[PDB]
Structure formats: C-alpha cells, structure tokens
C-alpha cells in the first residue's frame, strides 16, 4: 500500500475497509494516506537498535 | 371474556367456565371461530387480563380428579399431596404431620 | 439500562433500541480470536493501550451518564473508565491462554471427583438435543422449582424421566439443578440405576467443586460481614446470584449487605418487595407492583415474607451448576427464558382423562385401550396430552390427574431482575469504591437447552421468550430466532452474544468475555473444563 | 473555521493541529484564533474559490462520475482521489445554454480557475520569495544549518 | 384420454375415473391392452398431456381413506394432518391452530 | 407440511430398513434427516437415532469452524464478512438440490 | 414448502438464512466424504410416481 500500481478492488467501502486494516499499525504503511505528486511517507521511529 | 363475558363460571367464548367438564371446555374452546368480540359489545371489566378461565379449567381438574385412572374405590393412583406420601411424629403425640405430604387418599 | 415495563418485549424492546449504534460499529471485546504477539503488536490492537492493569478494565462508555438509566445512552463525548475485574477468568485469553487455562484444570482435576463417561454422555445429550420433548419444560414451570408440587407430581416425573430414558438415553431435567437435587432426594426409589447414577454423579460432582474453595482459603475473621471463601472465590461471594432463582432467598441475604446498592426491579416500583405465596385468588398474571414471589416453600403452612427457607448451601450449589457446569456440558449452546404463566397453566391443566367404567383397570397401554388419556381417542387440539404425546412421553391417567395442584401454586410472571453491589471490603480501596458491578438474574427462568424452533407445532416463542440474563447464556440460534429479529443481525448475532444491557453489561459483570469464550473455545474434557473453569472464577 | 460554525455535531472533531513531513509527526500550536484573523483568512478564501467558477466549470462537473470510473480501474487516479474526498461523496448535465458556440469555455474556464483558486496558498500566507541553492553541492540543509538560498522559485 | 377420452370421471383407457376405487382402477388399468386409439378416433382437446387421471386416482384414495386399517369406528390411524399432531394456543385466546397438523380425525 | 403428515409411513420405513440392514435410511436427503431429528425423536430405536442426531450435529460443528477464522467487520456489497470469506457462508452458490 | 397453509409467500422466503446453509455443508462437504465420488442427481417423473 506504499506505491500505486494496481487497479483496486471496484468496492470502494470494500477497497478502503482492506487498505486501512492492513495499513493500520504497519512500520511502513504511510503515515497518512498517498498524494498524488510527494513522497509515500514511511513513518519514522523514535529510536531503533 | 370476549363475545358474551362471563368468568367462571359462564361460556360463550372461551367455550366453559366453572362447573363445566374438562369436555365442552376442551371440546368447547376447540369448536370456536377466529373472530373477536361475537355475541358481545363489551370487554370485561377487569380487562381480558382476567377471563376468569383458567380458574375454571384447573378447578375442572379437580372435579375430574374424582374418577381417573381408577373406578374411585378401584387401585389407583398407584404410588398412593403424597404422590409418595411422608412421614409424621414417631407416634407419643398422636396428631399433625412431620412430612410435605402427610397422606393423599387413594380414591 | 434501566429496566422497562414488561419482562417479555424487554429484548425485543433492546434489538430495536440498539439497532443503529449496534449493527453499525465493531464490539470492542473482538481480541478472542488474537492470539498473543497479535496483541502485543503495535496494529490493530489498537485497544492495546487500554490494557494496563490485571485487576481492572479500561474501556470507552459515555461521559456525564449515570450508569443504571436510560434505554440508550445519550451519547456525548465519549469518556474513559475502569472497572474492576472481579474473578482472575476475567483476564482475556491472549493473555492467559485457554491452554494455559486448561492446563491448570488437569492440576487441580487430580485426586478429585470425576464425573463417568457414561454420566457425561447422558448429560450432554440433554443439551445437544433437538428432540427433547416440550412437557420438560412446562413441568419444570408447573413445579414453579417448589418442593411441594415436586413430590405432589414425583410420579408423574419418574415416568416422564424414565420414558425419556428408554426413548433416548438421556438425563431428563438437568437444565434445573432443584429439580435435580429432588430428583436425587426423593426419586432415588423409583428409577433405573443407570440413570439414577446420572443424577447422583452430577450432583455429586457440584459439591467436589464447592469445596475446593476451601482447599485453598486459609482460615481468618469475616470482613465486612463476609467469610474468608466469600472474599476468596466467586461463588461463595453471596453478592452474586445465580441466573435463574425461584425463590426470594438469594435477594434475602444480598438485599442485606455493605456492599449491596440497590436491586433494580422493574415492575411497578424500583425498589423490589415480597410475596408470600400465590393462588388462582391471589394470583394477576399481567402486574407491575415490582413484587416478587417467595414461595417455593414445601410447606404449605409454613409461609415467609422476611426469613429465607433454605440454608446458604443450597443457593451456593446452584451458583456452581448453573455457572460451572452447564458452561461446561452445552459449550455456550443454550439460553434462559421467562414464562407466560398465564398461557402455561392454560394448557397444562386442559385435559381429557376418560371417566372410567365401573370395575374397570387402569388402562396401561395407549395404544390399545380408549380408556387411557394417551390414546388416539383422547388426543385432543390444545390439550394437555397432546403435549405428552408430541413428545413421546408415557404417563397415564392419575399422574396427569394429580395435577390439580397447579391451582394452590403459581407464578404470576417471571421477573427480570438487575442488580449491583461494590467491590467487596477486602477489596475495596478508595479508588475502586464507586466502581459497581451490575449483575442481573431472572427470578423464575428457565434455561433452554437446545433450540428447537424448527418445528411448527408451538408458535414460535409462546410458553416462554429468550431474555439471555448473562453473556453465558446467550443462544446464537435462540437470539436469532425470536419472532422479530432484525435481519441486519443475522451474522452479527452469530459472534456477538446479545444480552440487554437492562439485564447488565459485559464490562460492568462480574463475569465477563473471556470465560465464556474459554467454555466454548476449550478442547479438554467436561470433567477438566469443570475445574479449570473453576478455578477462573477465584477473586483478584 | 469549523471551530466558528460552531460545530451542532459533537465535541470532538477531527485532529487538523497535526501534519507530517516525510516521517516526523509536526504537532501544530492550537492556542487562540481571534475573530478578525479568522474573517479575513475566511473571507478571502470563500471570496476567491467563488470566481473560479465560470460558466464552462459545469462543463467540468458533468465529469464526476467519470472521474469515479477511474477511481476504480487505475491505481493512480485511485490515490488521486483522497479517502476523504467530497468528490467522492458529491457523486453519491451540459444544460444546452451554449452562447452560440464560439467562446470556448472550458479554456476559459482554466484560466479563471487557475488564477484564483490556483493561487491560493500565496494570498492566504506570503508566498516563496527565496528557494534553497547549495553551490557546493550538498543536497539538503539540515535543521539549524544555514540555507544558501537563491532569488524566488 | 386414448379410446374413448373423458378424465374424471370416465373409465374406457386409463381404466376408470375418479371414485373409481382400490379395484377396477387398478384392476382396470391393469385390464387394458398395448393398443393406441382404441374406441377412439380423437386426442384429448387439451392433448394427452392431461388425461383427467392422476387426479381421480389420487382422489380415489381420499374416498378409500374412510374404512381401511380401521372400521372407522375401531382404533385407526395409530399415531393419531397430524400423523402425530400439533399444539395451539395456551387456551386463554380458544380457537384456531398452531401447529401445522391441529389433528387427524381418527376415522 | 407433508412430511409431519406423512410421519407415520416413514418412522416405519426408517425403522424397518435398519432392522433388514442396519443403515440410516434417507440420509442422501438433509431436508428429511433434519426432520427426522426434529419431529421423529420419539419413535426410532435410540441405536439409529443417533446415527441422524450425530449426522445432523456434525453439519453445525462445520458450519461453526467458519467463524472461527473470520473478523468481524462491516458488509461489503451487502455481504457479510462470512460470506467473503468462506464458500459454505456465501450465498452466491446455492447447494444442488433445492425444493 | 411452507409447512403452514394459511400463509403462504408470493415474495418473502419461509425459511431463515443458515437453513440453506447447512445444505451446501450437508451435500457439497459430507455427502462427498461419504459416497466418494459414487451418487449422481436426478430428475423426477412426478406425475409417474
């Protein structure tokens, strides 16, 4: 759910309900949804080992 | 009741009342029709909450309870309150009961 | 919620009341099907960071609402608030797997009672089945759980038991633990000992759990009125009672307590009050005074407005076959039920018993003679043994006859009755004392083992309506199938159990979630699921 | 705005104090907001979005529902639309009235539409008059650094 | 019908017509011969897609339904709609049925 | 409708078949069986009776595995999530033989 | 189907939901397991039976 490549499911409260459940506590899934022109957004940690 | 009220006991509607065999109650309350308010243009005092029927059908029981199962003089109930009766003061007292059920008469 | 008018749309009052805000959003207490690292992980558990302390509940209801009012919450601002966790069950199963959970049934099971595998196969029969015959359940009502008409109508039971017997191998009327403690009492006379073993073990059984609280309760004074077991387990605490009882005993001794708010009622008043006995004088079938019956009395002529008929035990014993063991024996498959008094006696004492000829036996068989009331020629629409006929029940003539009692005792209606009290002094602190658990309990219920709404000879819900008192008991397909369903809970009702919150709530219970979903969820035995649901219900 | 309407709805409305840049939460300063600030901020914003609607803009609107087409069967135009998207939930048309036909209105109406709704972060807020150039070559500047900065993008 | 068409009740082809009976019908239909058009020389005007039979046969039973397995008046059906019955209201209403088989008069 | 009417005939059918062989008799039918269960509890030797309720409980241990390993979550396209998930659940296939 | 004659259905169905339900379990997972592979469906001749 980083990038944009494929063609989503034609059930939008179907597309959007799978997004955010997987997209929900994901290391890489944006903070905060794709813009169109940006950058995806990885969130960052506050520390790391 | 519905149609012509009456509690126990009566009849038009909930076919009986008191003093009416289990049969024509049963019979009775089997053989009426679908519709509310026959014979009548009023509903009970009370309400329909009491209909008086019920006390009717269960003090029917009672007076069919006479001659079941047995002649009434013949061997029944069978186990003979007391479905299988209890057991009083050891005797040195000679009345009251120490049991739910003292006796029940086999008749 | 509050309680409202009458006990039989009080679900049906609940389902439509709670339609919107139900159906629509997501239960919070979903994390059963987690398992650990699952919970531990920053997603989707995103109620992680609500789950801090062991002995307490953190949960999101509303802000300014006092709790026991109002059909639905006037939502505001949503707040944020504890509740304490009262048995150590109560703790969710990603943290105290139901491996774990079991694992210390088996410890505690060793040295102990063991229920056979033949009393076990009988028992769970019982609720595994569809076919058992409907007069079950009217009897139980019609004995109003009394000791008085139990051995008024004792015959009449062994042959309802033992038919049943021959029929399918099956105890009869364990979905009552009175009638089951009467059945071993007085009946041990007449019945095969295959199945009089039955009731003997399952009875035995109770109390091999009811004293290992005292294995593991030191001695000491009573605190706040309270032993040492009360403050110890749960079902010695005297604060809870069990979900279904016949009497007025058990509010006797909890209406009487430090720890006891405020019983609510709902009937004509709040505040609860007292019945002696009933009779078809006596008796208003539809009524609202907020009063109870008390009688279950076997003595006529002994009656009680204050003083409570039984020992302690006794409500004891029924907190720990309702709570312990049929969790155990159904696998949350079952549901209680109030009566429609009114409409039972209608059909229990409507009845043709043929007049006997002069000189004439008891006719034994109903197939052949027209004198006995089960034959063909008796058999009448809406009467009594048409019923003992659906179900393949044998009785003849006087046994049905002695039914007569039903006029000196009776129920007007069941009621429905919501609860509270504090966390117990031993464990209360200043934090924790405006923390209520609000428990709700039927007072003459029934719990209805299998469904059977598959069949149309009984409309659909007529003798009795579902009213799930605990989260224990809730009927995926006993809910489902009251006659007004919403079919937008169809699947939603499958996982979820539906209890009004009039009849109290999961957090706020004293028995929450996760031990129900540890009954259902457990692979191990019936005796080793007894104890280690046993042992989840000891306090924190 | 919203905290002027005054929203009616409950008291608790959505985050706007909160951004993020790259990762890096940025929580906003959320302190006072006083009337005559918020008027003109709002009265050039609602001026504005006005006069960038023209005549050819319904032209532009009848294409709603096929925006939507797209939503669907492309991955980008998918990401275009955003969750919260009006748009989306606008969905949930030429009208004749064409003045003789040679005015050409969709031109027309960019051009409306990109002066002043196009601009709109520059006359809300001051905008760039500086942008970062780094001669020797080092592609970003950290925080607390100096900026070699050139004349306006 | 083949031969000469009439449906219930008639007889000449598919031996007999409603009423007909456990004999003659089956006996009858058992009596034909292989022949096609016998004493006939039409079709059934809705064809022989319905040759009026079946529902004779089926109604033959309902009158053969009355004496067998029991005088009538002696204990038939057994089980005694309602091969083994259904319940109604609690009483407290007294009529109409609720359970699909209300009763099978046992006759 | 016709089968409680029915009952009688077949109560003899099931019985007397289990008695030549000892088998379940209309078990390639589970609209009957259901029934079976249902009405026929009574009268039925309690051997092969519990041939059909074992047959009939083991139906609703696999209807129940379903929701096991399904969340809980909103419809989409008006189906439940146990339908989207599982086969069984979702109605789109109805079974083969439907009266 | 409706085992009462009084009401019948010209458009809402009798039965509830999970009816059918067990249906596709009894004859797609069971029967299967049961017959392996040996059954075949059939068509009636009413008016012949």
């Known amino acids: 759910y980083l990038g944009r490549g494929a063609p989503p499911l034609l059930d939008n409260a179907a597309a959007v309900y799978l997004r955010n459940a997987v997209v929900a506590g994901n290391r890489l899934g944006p903070a905060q949804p794709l813009p169109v022109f940006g950058c995806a957004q990885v969130p960052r940690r506050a520390g790391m080992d | ?107 | 919620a509050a309680p409202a008018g009458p006990g039989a749309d009080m679900q049906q009052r609940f389902l439509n009341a709670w339609r919107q805000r139900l159906a629509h959003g997501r239960v919070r207490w979903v994390a059963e099907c987690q398992m650990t690292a699952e919970q531990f992980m920053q997603p989707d558990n995103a109620n992680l960071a609500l789950e801090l302390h062991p002995a307490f509940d953190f949960f999101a209801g509303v802000a300014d609402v006092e709790l026991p009012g109002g059909e639905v919450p006037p939502a505001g601002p949503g707040a944020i608030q504890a509740t304490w966790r009262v048995v150590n069950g109560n703790l969710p199963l990603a943290l105290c797997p139901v491996a774990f959970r079991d694992a210390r049934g088996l410890e505690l099971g060793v040295g102990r009672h063991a229920m056979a595998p033949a009393t076990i196969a009988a028992v769970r029969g019982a609720f595994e089945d569809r076919s058992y015959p409907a007069v079950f359940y009217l009897l139980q009502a019609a004995i109003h759980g009394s000791e008085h008409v139990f051995c008024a109508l004792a015959r009449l039971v062994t042959q309802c038991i033992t038919s049943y017997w021959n029929n399918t191998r099956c105890a009869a009327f364990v979905n009552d633990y009175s009638l089951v403690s009467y059945i071993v009492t007085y009946l041990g006379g007449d019945l095969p000992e295959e199945c009089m073993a039955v009731y003997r073990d399952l009875v035995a059984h109770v109390e091999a759990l009811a004293q290992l609280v005292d294995d593991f309760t030191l001695p000491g004074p009573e605190l706040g009125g309270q032993a040492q077991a009360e403050l110890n387990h749960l079902m010695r605490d005297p604060a809870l009672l069990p979900p279904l009882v016949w009497d007025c005993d058990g509010l006797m001794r909890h209406a009487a307590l430090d720890r006891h708010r405020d019983c609510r009622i709902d009937a004509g008043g709040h505040e609860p009050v007292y019945a002696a006995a009933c009779n078809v004088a006596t008796a208003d079938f539809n009524r609202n005074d907020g009063r109870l019956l008390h009688n279950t009395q076997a003595r006529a002529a002994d009656a009680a407005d204050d003083r409570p008929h039984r020992p302690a035990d006794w409500t004891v014993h029924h907190k720990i076959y309702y709570y312990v063991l049929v969790p155990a024996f159904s696998r949350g498959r079952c549901c209680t039920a109030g009566v429609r008094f009114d409409r039972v006696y209608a059909t229990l004492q409507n009845m043709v018993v043929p007049e006997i000829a002069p000189g004439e036996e008891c006719p034994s068989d109903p197939v052949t003679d027209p004198a006995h009331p089960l034959h063909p020629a008796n058999l009448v629409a809406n009467t009594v043994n048409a019923m003992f006929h659906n179900g393949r029940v044998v009785v003849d003539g006087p046994a049905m006859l002695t039914l007569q009692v039903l006029a000196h005792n009776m129920a007007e209606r069941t009621t429905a009755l919501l609860c509270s009290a504090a966390p117990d002094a031993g464990a209360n602190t200043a934090s924790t004392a405006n923390m209520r658990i609000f428990d709700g309990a039927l007072h003459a219920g029934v719990l209805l083992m299998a469904p059977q709404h598959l069949d149309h000879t009984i409309q659909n819900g007529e003798y009795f309506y579902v009213l799930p008192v605990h989260a224990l008991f809730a009927g995926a397909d006993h809910v489902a199938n009251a006659p007004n369903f919403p079919p937008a809970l169809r699947d939603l009702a499958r996982h979820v159990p539906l209890v009004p919150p009039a009849l109290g709530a999961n957090y706020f219970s004293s028995i929450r979630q996760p031990v129900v979903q540890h009954a259902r969820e457990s692979a191990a035995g019936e005796n080793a699921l007894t104890y280690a649901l046993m042992a989840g219900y000891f306090k924190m | 705005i919203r905290d002027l309407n005054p929203d009616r709805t409950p008291g608790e409305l959505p985050d706007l104090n909160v951004l993020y840049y790259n990762g890096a939460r940025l929580s906003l300063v959320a302190d006072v907001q006083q009337l005559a600030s918020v008027n003109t901020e709002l009265r050039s914003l609602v001026l504005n979005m006005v006069y960038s609607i023209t005549e050819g803009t319904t032209l532009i609107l009848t294409l709603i529902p096929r925006l939507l087409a797209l939503s669907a069967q492309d991955g980008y135009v998918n990401a275009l639309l955003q969750m919260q998207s009006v748009t989306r939930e606008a969905a949930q048309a030429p009208m004749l009235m064409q003045d003789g036909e040679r005015r050409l209105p969709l031109y027309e109406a960019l051009v409306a539409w990109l002066a002043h709704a196009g601009q709109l972060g520059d006359i809300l807020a001051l905008a760039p008059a500086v942008r970062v150039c780094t001669f020797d070559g080092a592609a970003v500047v950290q925080s607390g650094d100096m900026a070699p900065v050139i004349r306006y993008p």
């Open chain 2, 1 to 107: 009741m519905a149609a012509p009220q009456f509690h126990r006991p009566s009849t038009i509607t909930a076919d009986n009342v008191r003093a009416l065999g289990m049969r024509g109650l049963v019979l009775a309350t089997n053989n009426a029709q679908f519709i509310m308010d026959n014979s009548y243009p009023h509903p009970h005092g009370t309400q329909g909450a009491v209909r008086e029927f019920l006390r009717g059908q269960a003090a029917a029981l009672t007076d069919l309870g006479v001659t079941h199962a047995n002649n009434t003089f013949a061997p029944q109930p069978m186990f003979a309150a007391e479905w299988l009766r209890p057991s009083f003061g050891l005797k040195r007292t000679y009345s009251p009961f120490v049991v739910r059920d003292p006796k029940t008469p086999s008749t």
